[PDB]
From TrEMBL, chain B:
It comes from Streptococcus mutans serotype c (strain ATCC 700610 / UA159). This is Hemerythrin-like domain-containing protein.
């Protein structure tokens, strides 16, 4: 079976089954938009009810501009352009989500191959609030 | 069969193996995976070998975890693996200052389970959280 067969990944091996589990057990909302600006993928780690940014099956396969409110589309294009052109490797944003009780840290990162060429945009969203609560008497 | 560059389901959409591998390498985490047979299978390629918080080498891949740590580190690693496998906790976290690396390191060991709740191995991911301490002000 193709999904259970061990394949080279990073510095060792994983099957597709294991690589998928790994992506689904990281504490991040992960999305990937390919070099044609097509929204291809998001992981399955954070429960839907706790997602900062709504992603739905319907968005998969569509151009990225459908993942973001229209009023904000100019800012989305500027980010994708800067990553694509090599002006930036990452663009970051942070804000408090009152509804979720999360301190949101957003990264858009250019995905580049070893030759340094553009292969798409990886977005990952993390709750960093716990990192401000490490020192606890409880 | 399926080659490494053809799209296949991952998460809530699609990735090729090449793309899933690129994503794992672009995340801001040093990742290692040990399977349910205690074999250290995999670590990502996310920082140069000489700059890793927890050095791993290709020589260690395919080896039982008991060969991948000195005796004193290993006893603690074993107790962590037991807690995770028995479903007592889903995660174990540790953190410490690394003046060597200019990093404040946050370590997570996580149980990797499928949707049935069955044990698939242990996922370790290491992050530098020092950069987040600046965002206290905002």
């Amino acid at each position: 079976l193709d999904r259970t067969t061990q394949q080279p990944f990073g510095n060792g091996y994983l099957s597709v089954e294991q690589a998928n589990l790994i992506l689904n057990h990281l504490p991040l909302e992960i999305t990937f938009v390919n070099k044609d600006d097509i929204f291809q993928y998001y992981n399955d780690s954070v429960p839907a009810a706790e997602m900062v940014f709504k992603r739905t099956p319907s968005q998969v396969g569509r151009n990225v501009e459908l993942c973001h409110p229209p009023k904000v589309l100019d800012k989305v294009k500027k980010v994708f352009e800067l990553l694509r052109n090599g002006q930036r490797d990452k663009v970051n944003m942070w804000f408090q989500s009152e509804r979720l009780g999360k301190f949101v840290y957003v990264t858009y990162a250019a995905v580049r191959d070893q030759a340094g060429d553009f292969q798409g945009v990886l977005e990952y969203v993390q709750d960093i609030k716990p990192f401000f609560e490490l020192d606890s008497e409880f």
